[PDB]
């Protein structure tokens, strides 16, 4: 009219969708599309249903590392989000805002606009860059967005509204890889877990109990000299296990990639190295506009550890050791409480404040008239 | 089990089984067995050339050449005679038993089979027991390196026969426990007025074994058994040899067993503390 | 799993929810004329196996007839155990026929699974179960007794204490 | 890239016009606000004779604001400029919705005003004369 907007952050792990002006995502569920192997099971299962019966379906993720790989399964996943079991909407009477992940090819960028108008026939569509949304959501145009989610962790320089492809770097370590590593650690503790079979059970142990150490030598002294880290955890089958130092050793992979045989430096050293390769004047402005987003930034102690680690780097390899000049080192790593789904939260606010505007939403009028795209950047 | 057994169980059950099956006329069973005893001993029971009617029992000691020097071969010739054959490649002494041709009383040969290691050691004692008996004083002492880093010194005198063990305690806690056990051997004739005398020294050797290279150490100790004619004569000869040569392992056996009992105490009290703690909860 | 009746014919009438299967008997009753194999032969051939099983899915009406005979076979063995001749076993298998409750009455401890009988269904059910009891008892007498001589065989008497589905007509 | 969440008020257009060619040579500032119901960037205040510290105190600590500051910059050489500094005060604790309307409207306002010296602060405490001069050195 009036209405009705909608929003969609298609994660690699999880789909977060809701409505413009939502304060939480009204639906969160795994970005999943399982086909059955044998004969209320249907010909296909999506999200919650598909995760529930995962030991009976050959399951596919159409999102690999934030990019779409399978447009066929991606259609089924979009049918599920819009279809009764979640949003129950007539796409044809709705505007929709989507998010685009870092370094997405324009081939994909197009194909979705094509998909949205051709196969679903939305009256309005918009495509926002994640890193820019998460910054706009906080009154910022320049700055560096650390998005650590399920599949991959991206460090995203943005300047006065434009993302910078050629300073945007990835760390191939995030949520799935930490859950995977925690399994290995519980294995060495003497619990016969399986990387495949018990991934979901251990993911929940990770979410519930893991944290990032501030000073690893001190966390290891605690691990080794006391039992204060040790926690019982009751598994689905009833068995109780003890989780201790592995609580902080697992997320430590983010800072020390080699711990799971991964080439690279680890999020803090990466962040430092990236900020340092920019203009002297914009360096200042980046260091005081670091922003966290995504699920894997929720580990207790993470923002403190990043602060500490950046200071150690700047001191050793920029101030060359003298601590007298450390005091001058302005630095801001803002960690909002709602940072788990900032891309959605930002898109929900923007799609709301921009709902009844006209030049903003790319229309079906426009795309038929034509064509893909229909982009106005 | 307080006293360690002298006989080898694996030798006896292997042979008793085999000989019981021969005496029924059952089909001869194939056998290949590689096992050990105390003091670095390695046994091997087998069928030579695949011949399953013949059962060879071989033994290998790294210090056999030293025992051989003190009449091991002639003692073994007495005991086994026909049964004793040329040593298997790598081993020092081999017995051969024909399943087609066995004695009536099976128990006699099987008992002596199980005492192969013991009978290897026995020669060096019988030698020095009769030096003392006949009064041949001032002979050379024997030096048997029964372990790599442990040594037994046997020495014949006017009236007595001394046997010195120079044993080692790997674990440092075992030194302190062993010290307490040895102390009771030193004050040990409170029990038996007629028993042998037992002397102990913690680091340095006695006045006797000083020197010709007796290793001094913090983790070494010298146990000395002063045996007399009553213990070394023909009537009580075999009993004495059976005890004396198992002594080292009897000592270490009991140190380890002693520590295992300490464990059951520690489990008790630890279990009690945990109950007392748990009673500090509202429930 | 357990053994079911494979004589389920397209044109088989019922009695309650049991199948009114024919039998080749000399005892008079409401059974159809019966070639070689019938439900009583099937029950005896299967008995020694089925009696151990506790669970049993009912595939069709013919199985409810198979169950009943199986249960009764155990009632014969209890009585045959004490006998001193194949002739005396026949006296008491006559008596064991003449002597039990039906679907509906105090069990018959299976009232959950079987269906109740009106006048016509009731008098015919009494008589069909009777004809099964009399013919099963007769055939068992031949099978149970050893001809060297006239004692019951321990190979049938060893089953006496075992109960089919932990149910019993006594 | 192409976002003008709020447009620029025609009246405000002018104020920035006149201020761009201002004849006065003291330190002066225009402060600007986003009107929620109108959805346009508007004038809040105009202030004359202000040091950087004094401007700091005029700004809301917990609401975003746009500022255009005519500051007499004495260079390292000694000779003088009156650069038109644009300052985006964007405090941290502010309503997400409000931050989005400011963030989305900044670029439209900056080209509309035709300014090239563009700065942004997370806290008013950062707005000092050392800070302003540090940035202008570029």
């Amino acid at each position: 009219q009036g209405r009705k907007v909608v929003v969609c952050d298609n994660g690699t792990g999880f789909v977060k969708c809701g409505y413009a002006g939502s304060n939480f995502p009204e639906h969160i569920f795994p970005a999943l599309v399982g086909r059955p192997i044998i004969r209320e099971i249907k010909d296909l299962m999506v999200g919650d249903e598909a995760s529930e019966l995962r030991s009976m379906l050959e399951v596919n993720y159409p999102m690999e590392n934030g990019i779409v790989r399978n447009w066929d399964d991606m259609k089924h996943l979009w049918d599920y989000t819009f279809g009764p079991e979640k949003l129950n909407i007539d796409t044809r009477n709705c505007k929709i805002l989507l998010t685009e992940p870092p370094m997405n090819p324009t081939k994909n960028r197009e194909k979705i606009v094509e998909v949205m108008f051709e196969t679903y026939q939305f009256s309005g569509v918009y495509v926002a860059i994640q890193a820019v949304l998460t910054l706009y959501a906080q009154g910022l145009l320049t700055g560096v967005v650390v998005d650590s989610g399920d599949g991959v962790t991206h460090i995203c320089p943005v300047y006065e509204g434009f993302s910078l492809p050629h300073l945007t770097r990835r760390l191939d370590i995030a949520g799935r890889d930490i859950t995977r590593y925690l399994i290995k650690l519980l294995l060495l503790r003497g619990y016969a877990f399986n990387h495949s079979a018990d991934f979901e059970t251990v993911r929940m142990i990770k979410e519930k109990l893991c944290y990032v150490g501030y000073n690893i030598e001190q966390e290891q002294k605690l691990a080794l000299e006391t039992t204060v880290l040790v926690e019982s955890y009751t598994l689905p089958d009833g068995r109780i296990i003890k989780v201790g130092g592995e609580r902080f050793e697992a997320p430590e992979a983010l800072f020390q990639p080699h711990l799971i045989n991964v080439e690279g430096v680890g999020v803090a050293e990466l962040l430092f190295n990236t900020i340092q390769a920019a203009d002297i004047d914009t360096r200042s402005e980046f260091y005081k506009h670091i922003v966290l987003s995504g699920g894997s930034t929720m580990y207790p102690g993470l923002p403190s550890r990043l602060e500490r680690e950046l200071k150690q780097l700047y001191l050793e390899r920029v101030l060359k050791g003298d601590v007298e000049k450390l005091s001058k080192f302005k630095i801001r790593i803002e960690d909002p409480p709602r940072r788990k789904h900032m891309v959605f939260l930002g898109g929900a606010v923007l799609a709301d404040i921009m709902k009844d505007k006209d030049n903003f939403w790319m229309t079906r009028q426009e795309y038929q008239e034509k064509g893909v795209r229909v982009l106005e950047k | 089990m307080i006293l360690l057994e002298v006989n080898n169980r694996i030798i006896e059950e292997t042979l008793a089984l085999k000989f019981e099956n021969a005496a029924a006329g059952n089909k001869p069973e194939a056998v290949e067995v590689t096992f050990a005893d105390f003091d670095g001993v390695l046994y091997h029971i087998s069928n030579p050339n695949g011949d399953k009617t013949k059962v060879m029992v071989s033994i290998s000691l790294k210090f056999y050449k030293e025992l051989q020097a003190h009449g091991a071969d002639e003692l073994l010739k007495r005991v086994y005679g026909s049964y004793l054959v040329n040593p298997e490649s790598g081993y020092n002494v081999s017995l051969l038993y024909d399943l087609e041709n066995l004695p009536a009383s099976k128990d006699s040969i099987v008992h002596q089979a199980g005492m192969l290691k013991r009978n290897c050691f026995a020669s060096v004692f019988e030698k020095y027991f009769q030096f003392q008996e006949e009064g041949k004083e001032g002979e050379n002492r024997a030096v048997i390196h029964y372990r790599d880093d442990e040594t037994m010194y046997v020495e014949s005198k006017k009236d007595r026969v001394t046997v010195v063990f120079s044993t080692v305690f790997k674990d440092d806690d075992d030194v302190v426990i062993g010290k307490v056990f040895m102390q009771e051997f030193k004050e040990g004739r409170r029990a038996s007025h007629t028993a042998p005398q037992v002397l102990f020294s913690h680091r340095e050797p006695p006045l006797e074994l000083k020197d010709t290279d007796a290793a001094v150490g913090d983790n070494i100790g010298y146990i000395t058994f002063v045996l007399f004619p009553r213990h070394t004569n023909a009537s009580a000869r075999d009993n004495t040899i059976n005890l004396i040569h198992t002594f080292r392992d009897y000592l270490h056996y009991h140190i380890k067993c002693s520590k295992a009992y300490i464990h059951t105490r520690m489990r008790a009290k630890t279990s009690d503390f945990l109950k007392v703690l748990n009673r500090a909860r509202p429930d | 799993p357990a053994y079911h009746s494979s004589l389920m014919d397209p044109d088989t009438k019922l009695i309650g929810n049991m199948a009114l299967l024919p039998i080749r008997s000399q005892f008079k009753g409401p059974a159809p004329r019966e070639k070689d194999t019938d439900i009583v032969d099937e029950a005896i051939y299967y008995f020694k196996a089925n009696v151990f099983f506790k669970n049993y899915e009912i595939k069709n009406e013919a199985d409810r007839t198979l169950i009943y005979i199986t249960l009764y076979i155990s009632e014969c063995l209890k009585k045959l155990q004490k006998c001193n001749s194949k002739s005396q076993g026949e006296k008491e298998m006559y008596t064991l026929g003449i002597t039990f409750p039906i679907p509906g009455e105090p069990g018959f401890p299976l009232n959950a699974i079987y269906a109740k009988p009106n006048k016509q269904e009731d008098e015919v059910m009494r008589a069909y179960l009777q004809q099964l009891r009399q013919e099963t008892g007769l055939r068992l007498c031949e099978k149970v007794f050893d001809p060297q001589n006239d004692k019951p065989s321990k190979w049938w008497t060893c089953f006496v204490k075992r109960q089919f589905m932990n149910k019993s007509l006594s | 890239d192409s976002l003008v969440v709020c447009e620029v008020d025609p009246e405000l257009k002018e104020t920035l016009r006149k201020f761009r060619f201002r004849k006065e040579t003291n330190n002066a500032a225009i402060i600007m606000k986003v009107d929620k119901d109108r959805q346009m960037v508007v004038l809040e205040d105009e202030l004359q004779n202000i040091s950087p510290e004094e401007l700091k105190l005029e700004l809301p600590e917990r609401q975003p604001r746009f500022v255009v500051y005519s500051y007499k910059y004495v260079h390292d050489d000694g000779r003088v400029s009156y650069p038109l500094c644009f300052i985006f005060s964007s405090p941290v604790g502010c309503k997400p919705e409000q931050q989005m309307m400011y963030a989305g409207s900044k670029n439209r306002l900056v080209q509309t005003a035709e300014l090239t010296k563009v700065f942004e602060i997370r806290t008013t405490d950062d707005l000092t004369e050392t800070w302003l001069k540090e940035k202008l050195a570029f």
Partner: protein, 342 residues
Amino acid sequence: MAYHSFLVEPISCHAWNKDRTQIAICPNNHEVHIYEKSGNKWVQVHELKEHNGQVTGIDWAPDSNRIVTCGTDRNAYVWTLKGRTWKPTLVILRINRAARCVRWAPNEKKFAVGSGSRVISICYFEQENDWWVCKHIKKPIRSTVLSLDWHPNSVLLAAGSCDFKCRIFSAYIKEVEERPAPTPWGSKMPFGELMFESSSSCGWVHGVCFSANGSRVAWVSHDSTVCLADADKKMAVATLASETLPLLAVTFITESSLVAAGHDCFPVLFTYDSAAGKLSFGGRLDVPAGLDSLHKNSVSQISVLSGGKAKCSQFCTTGMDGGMSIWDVRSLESALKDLKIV
């Protein structure tokens, strides 16, 4: 002597509604339970599940009937009763360490949150944005803030911290209230101004409280002392060293009498003799696991149920034993006849 065991783990904090029909508690976790009384029985009516860590402070604004909570997850929520359900509104405290305590002001126009950020957050509602704003009182606080209590004027604010100090600050927020009239504490009360600071250089300050008319502040430290300053006597500090274990909570019950509780697990009375300028130990109020006190573990909080801090007739204590006790001061005066209040 009216003990009720809500649970067996601690009650971290509690708050009562206006008419004391309902009590909110945190049963040593991330949630707040509200129990309404029904005849003899306490009955749970609500669960407030939004925090993602232990809740450390709860306060109930009596007239507006709004609960504020603060927890170790660094957040604070203002809870608003919508129909049958308390719905939460997230407040951006902008603090980087756990929240520790929270108290509405008397005027109910703003609340204060002490934290481990070495800072007090003063939050008020901004009517135009429909948004909770909050300003910080930073210096000279050098450690965690463990306790707060407002002056009756809703402007002066006392605080106890792990840097061993009781302080009085001005939390004057010009955008919500009239400027305050001068106090014995001072005339200049801009936001953040330090009106008073204690001279004790040891002992963590666990509880602090203003007097009924606000002239006097009293606090308790971990060196087993209780202290009081009255601004009428030029902020002179009366001190008393206890023979027993530290106190954790304190409140005025008259203008010159205090009730305090801590690790001994029972309430104790202190009288202040205005003339002689000294604090005096009025004795134990709780008179008969193995413990002889009602509470079987440290008492962590104590609150005035009726009569306010001028003529308190009933007071509440919650403790680490999961117990809540109601104390009627008239009943206590019947039992211990040689017991003198004021």
